[PDB]
């Protein structure tokens, strides 16, 4: 039913009543075979069908999902995201889902005004979770975060801090003794949710005077 | 709370009489 999945996805987007339940049961069986490692080559085909449907009618499907079938859309997205999380092999489905999520986010930001983030909130949360990639700079990222702090962009600062936290969780480098001190007062002055983890990471593998920086900051 | 309150089917709830019956009938362990 892999060929007819894309057509039922359009029926699932418009009106399904029980076809949505059947598709969700089929996807749970695929997740079952994926967890049991019993050759579950069904997630990518449904992902390909969903991506094709999005490329065909991005606005209509997003409007139908975020307007009427919010619950069914959220259930399908939750099934897809946990399935992608289980299937960590080669991240091909992860990249396809990231592209589909970016396109759906663009369509939702364009069209959904009254039904603001009924499921697009969970979509954006999954988007941030999947886009939490590992930074490779770890020295100019501090300057970028300092620039974002003067610019006062909350989402950009959160993304930069999340990147720097994985960057600190990666292999340690030689940190500057002035840039970190400047950045810590800025994230302290701003309400920073990840401030404690950032301070712990920057204080554990530190190539500088940690007590001096802490005393100066205090 | 448990899933179903009027549950006759639970181990530690059941009393001495058919505890003795349980001992005998688990020892038996078959029906024709």
């Amino acid at each position: 039913a892999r060929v007819v999945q894309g057509s039922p996805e359009v029926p699932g987007i418009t009106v399904r009543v029980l076809q949505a339940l059947a598709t969700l049961l089929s996807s749970p069986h695929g997740g079952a075979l994926v967890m049991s490692m019993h050759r579950s080559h069904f997630l990518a085909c449904p992902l390909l069908r969903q991506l094709c449907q999005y490329q065909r009618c991005v606005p209509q499907d997003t409007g139908f999902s975020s307007l009427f079938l919010k619950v069914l859309l959220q259930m399908l997205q939750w099934l897809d995201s946990p399935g992608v999380e289980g299937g960590p092999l080669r991240a091909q489905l992860r990249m396809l889902a990231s592209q589909a999520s970016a396109g759906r986010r663009l369509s939702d930001v364009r069209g959904g005004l009254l039904r603001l983030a009924e499921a697009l909130a969970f979509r954006q949360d999954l988007e941030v979770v999947s886009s939490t990639v590992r930074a490779v700079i770890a020295t100019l990222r501090s300057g970028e975060q300092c620039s974002v702090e003067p610019d006062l962009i909350s989402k950009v600062l959160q993304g930069l801090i999340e990147v720097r936290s994985p960057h600190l969780e990666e292999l340690l480098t030689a940190f500057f003794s002035a840039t970190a001190d400047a950045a810590s007062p800025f994230p302290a002055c701003k309400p920073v949710v990840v401030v404690s983890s950032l301070l712990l990471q920057e204080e554990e593998p530190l190539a500088g005077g940690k007590p001096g920086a802490d005393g100066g900051s205090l | 709370a448990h899933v179903w309150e009027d549950n006759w089917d639970d181990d530690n709830v059941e009393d001495d009489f058919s505890n003795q019956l349980r001992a005998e009938l688990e020892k038996h362990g078959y029906k024709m």
Partner: protein
Amino acid sequence: PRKAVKRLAIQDLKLLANKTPHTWSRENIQALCECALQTPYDSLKLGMLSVLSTLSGTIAIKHYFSIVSSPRSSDLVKLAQECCYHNNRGIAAHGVRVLTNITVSCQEKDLLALEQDAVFGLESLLVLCSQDDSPGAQATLKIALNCMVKLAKGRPHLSQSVVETLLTQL
């Protein structure tokens, strides 16, 4: 910003919510809801959702939805929906607890969409806990079945739908 101190706040607001629920006020609920939206951490969101689950089970939901702002405009509903459709299993379990409690408790005109959303996220929890097979998974499963019994007994309207969904899970 101390995570352990926030966990203290969790395990203390649980105690206050369990002891004296009627003293909980609308601004307190709204502030806790804003904190649960603005948190980044799944564990602390889980704790706050447990607190909201207990408060929803108690009477204070009527205080939060006592008029003299739409119920949909109330910040509780959005948090409950997004956390019921969140990825993590315990977060989803407490979200569907909040949804079941509010659906059985309050009866306003616009809550039918919440009823439908709650039941559909409910078989989402059924499929997840049915094919998870963990001790915590079975705990969240028993939580979902408590939600079933309470929802069906409080409202007989959704009974046939929930029974046929449970048969599909069978």
